[PDB]
Amino acid sequence: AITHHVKEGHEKADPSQFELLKVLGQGSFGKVFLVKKISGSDARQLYAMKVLKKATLKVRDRVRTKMERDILVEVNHPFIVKLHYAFQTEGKLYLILDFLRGGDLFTRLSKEVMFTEEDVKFYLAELALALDHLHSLGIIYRDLKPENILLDEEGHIKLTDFGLSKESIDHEKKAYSFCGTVEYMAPEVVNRRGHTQSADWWSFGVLMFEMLTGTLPFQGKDRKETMTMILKAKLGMPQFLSPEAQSLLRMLFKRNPANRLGAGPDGVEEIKRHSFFSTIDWNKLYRREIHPPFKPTFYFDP
Numbered sequence: 001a002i003t004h005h006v007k008e009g010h011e012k013a014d015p016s017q018f019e020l021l022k023v024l025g026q027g028s029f030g031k032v033f034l035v036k037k038i039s040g041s042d043a044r045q046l047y048a049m050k051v052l053k054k055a056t057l058k059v060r061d062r063v064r065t066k067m068e069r070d071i072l073v074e075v076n077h078p079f080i081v082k083l084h085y086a087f088q089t090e091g092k093l094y095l096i097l098d099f100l101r102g103g104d105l106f107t108r109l110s111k112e113v114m115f116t117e118e119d120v121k122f123y124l125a126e127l128a129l130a131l132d133h134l135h136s137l138g139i140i141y142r143d144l145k146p147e148n149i150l151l152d153e154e155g156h157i158k159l160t161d162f163g164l165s166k167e168s169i170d171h172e173k174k175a176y177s178f179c180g181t182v183e184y185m186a187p188e189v190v191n192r193r194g195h196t197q198s199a200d201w202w203s204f205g206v207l208m209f210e211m212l213t214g215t216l217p218f219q220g221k222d223r224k225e226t227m228t229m230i231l232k233a234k235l236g237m238p239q240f241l242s243p244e245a246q247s248l249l250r251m252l253f254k255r256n257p258a259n260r261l262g263a264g265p266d267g268v269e270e271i272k273r274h275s276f277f278s279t280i281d282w283n284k285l286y287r288r289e290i291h292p293p294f295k296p297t298f299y300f301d302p
C-alpha cells in the first residue's frame with residue numbers, strides 16, 4: 001500500500017492553558033504545582049500539575065514519566081489519583097492530575113506523632129484495595145511512604161506518584177531495581193535478589209508500624225546501616241500495640257516473600273480477612289461509604 005502524505009489536526013493541550021497558583025511540593029522526578037484551568041469546558045477547575053524538566057537528557061526519569069502516564073490512563077479506582085491530561089513541549093513533560101485538597105498523610109502523621117488503631121485500620125484498608133488493584137494489573141507500587149498518600153476533601157486516600165513503580169510483573173517475572181525510600185524496602189529489594197508484588201506487603205507493614213508508633217521499625221544511623229537492619233529484621237515490638245496489630249505486623253514482616261501475608265494463593269484476601277480488619281465492610285469501603293477519621297464572622301447585630 002502507498003502512504004498518504006497527509007497530517008491529522010488536533011487542538012493540543014498546552015501549559016499556557018493552566019494558570020500557575022503555587023508549588024505544592026516535589027514528586028519523584030519533578031515539582032508539583034497547584035494550577036487553574038483557563039479555557040475549555042473545565043475552565044476554573046483546580047488541578048495538580050507535575051512537571052519534568054530537561055526531559056531530553058534525563059532518559060531514566062523520562063521513561064518512568066511515560067510508564068506513570070500509562071499506569072494512570074489504565075487505572076480506574078476510588079483510591080488512585082485520576083490523570084486528566086498529559087502533554088509535552090521541547091524539553092518538558094506535564095501530567096495534570098486531581099488536586100487533593102487535604103494534603104498528604106505525612107503532614108497529618110507528623111502533627112499527631114502517631115494515629116489511633118481505628119484511624120490506621122481505615123487508612124490501611126483503603127490502601128490495601130488500591131495496592132491490590134495495581135497488583136491485578138501486573139504492577140508493583142514500590143514507593144509506599146506517607147508523602148505518596150494524599151487526602152481528598154472528604155478524607156479518603158489517593159495514591160498519587162507512580163514514577164518508581166514497575167509494570168508487567170506476572171508469572172515468574174521479577175524486578176531488580178533499587179528505588180524508593182530505604183526504610184520501606186522489603187529485604188528482597190535491599191539484597192537485590194528480585195522482587196514481585198509481595199514486596200508491597202512488606203512496605204504496607206512498615207507504614208502500618210510507623211503510623212501506629214510514630215517511628216520506623218528498621219532503621220540505623222545512616223542508609224547503609226538501615227539496609228543491614230532490614231536484612232536482619234530483628235523487630236522490637238512496642239507493648240501498646242493490640243494483639244491484632246502485633247499478629248498482622250508479624251505476618252507481614254516475613255523475610256521470605258513466599259511466606260508473607262498477601263503472597264499466598266488467596267492474595268489480598270489473606271490481608272482482608274485478618275482479625276486486625278474484622279470491623280471493615282470492604283464493599284462499603286470501596287463505595288467510599290465509610291466515614292474517614294479526619295475531614296480537611298465577628299459582626300453581630302440581630
Ligand SMILES: COc1cc(Nc2nc3cccc(-c4cccc5nc[nH]c45)c3o2)cc(OC)c1OC
Nearest residue numbers: 024025026027032048098099100101103148160161
Ligand atoms: C504535598 O502537599 C500538599 C498537596 C496537596 N494536594 C495534592 N494533590 C496532588 C495530586 C497529585 C500529586 C500531588 C503531590 C504534590 C506534592 C508532592 C507529592 N508527592 C506525591 N504526590 C505529590 C498532589 O498534591 C494539597 C496540599 O495542601 C492543600 C498540600 O500541602 C501543601
